[PDB]
Amino acid sequence: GFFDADLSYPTVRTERMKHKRRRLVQGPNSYFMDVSCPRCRQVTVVYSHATTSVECKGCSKKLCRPTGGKALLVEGCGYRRKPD
Amino acid sequence: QLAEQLAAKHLRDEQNRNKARKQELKKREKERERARR
Amino acid sequence: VRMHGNGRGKASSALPYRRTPPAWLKIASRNVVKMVCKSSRKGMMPSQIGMELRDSMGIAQVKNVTGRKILRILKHNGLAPEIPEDLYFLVKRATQMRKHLERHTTDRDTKYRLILVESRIHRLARYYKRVKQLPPTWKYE
Amino acid sequence: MQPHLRKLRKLKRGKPSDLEESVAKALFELEASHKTLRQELPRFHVNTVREVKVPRSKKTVLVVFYPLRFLMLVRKVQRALTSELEKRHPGCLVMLVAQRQITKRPTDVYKLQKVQRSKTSTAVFENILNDMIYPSDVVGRRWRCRTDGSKLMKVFLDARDRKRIESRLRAVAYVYKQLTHRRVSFGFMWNPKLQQVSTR
Amino acid sequence: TMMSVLANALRTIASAERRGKRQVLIRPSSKVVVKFLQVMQKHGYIGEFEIIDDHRAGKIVVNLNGRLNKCGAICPRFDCATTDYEKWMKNILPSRQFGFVVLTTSLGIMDHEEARSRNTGGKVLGFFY
Amino acid sequence: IGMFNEEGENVDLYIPRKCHATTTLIEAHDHAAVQISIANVGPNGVINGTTTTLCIAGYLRSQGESDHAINHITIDRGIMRIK
RNA sequence: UGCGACAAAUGCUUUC
RNA sequence: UGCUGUUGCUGUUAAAGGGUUCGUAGUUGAACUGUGGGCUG
Ligand SMILES: [Zn+2]
Numbered sequence: 164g165f166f167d168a169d170l171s172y173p174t175v176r177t178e179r180m181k182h183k184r185r186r187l188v189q190g191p192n193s194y195f196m197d198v199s200c201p202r203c204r205q206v207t208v209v210y211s212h213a214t215t216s217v218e219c220k221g222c223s224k225k226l227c228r229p230t231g232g233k234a235l236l237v238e239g240c241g242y243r244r245k246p247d
Numbered sequence: 248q249l250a251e252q253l254a255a256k257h258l259r260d261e262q263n264r265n266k267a268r269k270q271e272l273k274k275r276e277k278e279r280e281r282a283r284r
Numbered sequence: 285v286r287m288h289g290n291g292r293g294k295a296s297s298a299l300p301y302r303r304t305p306p307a308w309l310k311i312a313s314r315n316v317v318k319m320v321c322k323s324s325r326k327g328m329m330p331s332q333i334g335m336e337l338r339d340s341m342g343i344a345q346v347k348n349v350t351g352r353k354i355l356r357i358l359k360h361n362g363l364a365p366e367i368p369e370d371l372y373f374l375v376k377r378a379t380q381m382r383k384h385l386e387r388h389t390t391d392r393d394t395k396y397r398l399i400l401v402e403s404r405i406h407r408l409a410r411y412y413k414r415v416k417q418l419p420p421t422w423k424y425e
Numbered sequence: 426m427q428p429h430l431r432k433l434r435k436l437k438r439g440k441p442s443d444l445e446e447s448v449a450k451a452l453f454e455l456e457a458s459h460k461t462l463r464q465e466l467p468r469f470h471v472n473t474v475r476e477v478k479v480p481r482s483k484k485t486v487l488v489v490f491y492p493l494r495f496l497m498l499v500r501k502v503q504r505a506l507t508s509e510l511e512k513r514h515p516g517c518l519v520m521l522v523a524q525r526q527i528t529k530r531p532t533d534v535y536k537l538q539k540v541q542r543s544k545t546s547t548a549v550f551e552n553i554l555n556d557m558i559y560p561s562d563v564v565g566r567r568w569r570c571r572t573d574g575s576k577l578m579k580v581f582l583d584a585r586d587r588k589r590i591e592s593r594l595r596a597v598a599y600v601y602k603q604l605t606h607r608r609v610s611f612g613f614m615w616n617p618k619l620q621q622v623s624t625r
Numbered sequence: 626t627m628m629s630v631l632a633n634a635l636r637t638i639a640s641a642e643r644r645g646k647r648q649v650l651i652r653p654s655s656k657v658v659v660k661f662l663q664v665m666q667k668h669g670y671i672g673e674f675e676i677i678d679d680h681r682a683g684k685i686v687v688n689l690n691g692r693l694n695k696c697g698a699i700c701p702r703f704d705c706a707t708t709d710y711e712k713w714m715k716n717i718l719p720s721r722q723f724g725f726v727v728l729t730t731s732l733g734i735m736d737h738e739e740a741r742s743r744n745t746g747g748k749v750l751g752f753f754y
Numbered sequence: 755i756g757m758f759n760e761e762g763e764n765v766d767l768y769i770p771r772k773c774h775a776t777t778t779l780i781e782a783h784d785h786a787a788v789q790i791s792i793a794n795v796g797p798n799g800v801i802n803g804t805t806t807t808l809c810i811a812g813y814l815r816s817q818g819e820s821d822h823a824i825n826h827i828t829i830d831r832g833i834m835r836i837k
Numbered sequence: 838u839g840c841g842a843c844a845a846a847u848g849c850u851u852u853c
Numbered sequence: 854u855g856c857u858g859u860u861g862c863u864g865u866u867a868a869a870g871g872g873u874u875c876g877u878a879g880u881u882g883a884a885c886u887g888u889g890g891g892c893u894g
Contacts, residue, residue, distance in 0.1 A: 165825060165836050170648045171675050171686045178619040187620050188565070188679045189298045195306075195342065208342035217340040227339075247306035275849065282431070282850080288875090301617075301680060304562050314852075396874085403875060435843070468848050494847045526846080530886060537886065543846065545886045566678040570659075572666055576888060606890050628882055645776045645814075655884065682884040691777035716860075 194244055198226065201239025208245070209234070288400045303348050313350040316343060317357055324363045330354045331369060368417060374405050375424070429453035432470050444474045448489060451513050461505050465498055472524055479599045486596050487519045488604075496523055503559050518596050522556050522604070525549045550605045554580070557597050561586045564617035577610060584615040584623045630655050632698040634685075635751055638671075642693045649689065653682035657750075660734040662687065664727055665696070665753055668736075696753040702729075706746045710737050717752050724754030773811040775823035786812030790824075792833065806833065 168174070173187065183192050193211045200207075203222040210217075213234045218224035228235040236242055285291040311319075319341075323333045333354055337343040347353050358364045365372065381398050385391060405424050412418040430438045432452045433445060441449070448471060456466040472490040479486060487510075491499065499506070499521055510519045528544040531537050542548060555563070565581035582590065594611045601609050615623040627633060634651045641649035651658070654676065662685070665671050672688035705713060705728060714737065718724040725736040730747035740747065756766035771780045773787075780787050789809050794802040808827060814820045828834050 165829060167826060170650050171677075172622060173620070175616070175619055175621055178621075183298045184294070184296075187677065187684070188301055190300050190618050191298055195344075207340065210339045210344075213339040215335055215339045245306065245308060247308075272849080279850070302562055302564060399875065406876095464850095465848080467850050492845080492847090494845070496847060498848050528886090540886060541846085542886065547886065568676040568678075570663065570666070570674050570676070572669075572673055574663065574667065578888095602890095607888075626882070630883070645778075653884070656887080 196242045196244055198236065199241045200226070201237065209236075209242070287404065299345070303345070305349055309342055309349070311343065311349070316346060316350050317352075319343075320346065320354060320357050321361055321363060324358055324361075329365065329369050330358060368412060371405070371408055371412065374401060374408065377401060378405065432466075434470065434472050437473065442474075444476060444487070445471070447514075448474045448487070448510070451510055455506075455509055459505070459509065462502055462509070465502050469495055469498060477600055477603055479596050482595065483516075484596065485517050486600055487514060487517050488600060489519065489521050490524050491521065493523045493525060499523070500559065518593060520557055520600060521559075522553060525552065550607065553604060554601060554609070557600065558582070558590065561590055564614050565620065577608060579610045579612055581612045581614045581617065581622070583617060584613045587613050587623075629698065629700060630682075631657050631661065631750065632700060634658050635661075635696045635698050638687065638689075638693070639696050642689055642691075642695075645691075647689055649687050651685040651687065654685050655682065657729075657734070658685070661727060661750065664725070664734065664736055665693075668725065670753060694754050696751065698751040699749045702748040702750060704746070705749055707741065707744060709746075710741055713737070713749065719754055724752065726752050771809050773814070774808045774827050775814060776811065778811055780809065780811055784812045786815050788815070792828075806831065 168177070178186060183189060196209050196211065198207050198209045199205070200219045200222055203219055205219060205222065207217070207219065209227055211233055213227050214229045216229075217227035217234075219226060226237050226240060228237070285293070316337075319337070320333060323336060324330075328336070334346060337346060343349055350357075355364065367375070378398065378401050381394060381401070385394060385398070388394070409418060409422060409424055413420055413422065429450050429452070430441065432449045433441060437445060452466065452469070452471070455462050457463070469491070472492060475488045475490070477486040477488060503521060507519050507521065511517065526544055527546050527549050528540055530545075531540065561582050563580055564583050567579045567581075568576055569579065570576050598609050598611065601607065613623045615621055630653060634654075637651055638649055659676065662671065662674060666674075670690075670693050672690050674685055674687040677684045677686070699717075710726075713726050714721060718726065725738070727734065727736055727750045728740055728747040729750055730740055730745045732743060732745055734750070756764050756769050759765050770782075772778065773780060787810065789807060791805040791807045794804045794806065796802050808824075810820050810823060814823055829836050
């Protein structure tokens, strides 16, 4: 304690525990990833919350199982979060 | 009659636009020759 | 859903403040436009077109890459649907309910929901006629 | 007739000025001797060049005006063009600004409905600021209203670009006042998503 | 639904002042709200405030100094001629020695004392004391 | 400070105290209001003659927020260190 | 029909 | 006589919220085009 709070300049601990539309300025929760392939090893950009079918070009084309939140990635692929 | 009077007077502007495009291309051709020499 | 019913839910997307492409996106704007038109010819509606580009194609917010919106691009190319997208889906829902109700005449809950949907169609068609997106004598069945 | 004079306005090429001739000279010599600029400079030309002296700076600012038709052309090579022109003018900072028109706000409600929003002073002034800091983007904006009655605008930039733009912020603020007659202040934000301000 | 942005903001400020808070967040904002706050600031009833941009109707953070008793809007915005200032003063102000009625006129938004000096009427927006 | 007649003299008797936290007048019937004096200390660690005095209104104490109010008052006054 | 000069809020020495 | 209430009334239990929804006239309806500047005292 012993420290006041400025509504205009909140701390990181308080701002992190907020709904995306309850922050001082609202913003997204999602991001993009670079994803490899099982036994094919190609490059595809996949949304973190994808709900349609994402397929590998010229391959088995089965990845990105959709859920009620973030999509699940098949164990045969490596993923890396893209910047920005 | 009103429709036929409007149609020609509002669809002869295509020829005018074609004239404008052709004129500009000729000026560019002139500028391209100027850059040639 | 607050127009009809007792729902008070607040679940939607939140657009970012920074409207610039992430700088790893190498697709040119003219390729994105051709990319939108091809998906329309396959038969997909504009709301489904945006999701296909977002999910497996790297393009979030087509408007930020190419300065235009998806429906504006389709209107320019002559690929816009004859009836607005939201009106098409509401009419399809009412048709499926009416087909169900002739076999099941005692389903009084479904009769109640049909009155709500038909009121929504008349309210929506009223707006589209005013902004001249529908013929002045469209007259839902 | 001078081949390098091709890269100027056809009105000003008749009796060119000293600073415009030097910039036009550098532009023509750059078309042939650069990989990235070889495929964009053939179609480019410049309206005018104006120099601005910043008080207590020991550096000058070269502001280059160009027509708005080449906005997307300049954006593609804004970084390479800026550095190359700076390597030819020691002790100077260059600034590529497009020439925009402003419609005065009408006093009639019917006229106000027909104003092109691209030509409002609100849209024009913020586009000028983006031009001067183009590799960076604005991540936030605030206005502070003092008890005396002055309102001051603060623009926040990403902290990842501090090392590349911090030494130019004093010149940017001065030129902005010279062009738009409005004040501006600058700050940096690490993690702009959570609105966290980095005070070095 | 929300019908008046100005009435919503003034109610929020008054409640925070009654509860002894030091800062209050106002959402959403508008041009009319900012002008009203500047009239309050000029007479010393609030401190500094900050406007935050979010590409929508923004937000305002206001600093309170404890000197505000009540602020509120008047709805609907009745017309007030230069001869009606006395009537409005006796009806909604605690006394004739302090407190202000805020109006919008052809010359801008101002308090009743400034409006009377310049011989102009208008519509009533709110009050504070 | 107070009301002046415009004749030159004060006509307002008993200018009241103002709560440090909330800047509100303290009435004569507020029997929960308190005044606290804190000793000043010299460099050697021995107290000094001077003292620091503050007042808290009764409403804050009954709500149970006087402790929080006292902390922020002393931090601003520099009586104690925040960290 | 030809010719001269200057603009252009969106690169024709361009795109497909 | 603020016991007709625009200023200015009441509606859990004193008199008084329609059993619940849909809906047309009617009433009400979010933000934005917008700090003029430079020289003297
Ligand atoms: Zn594969």
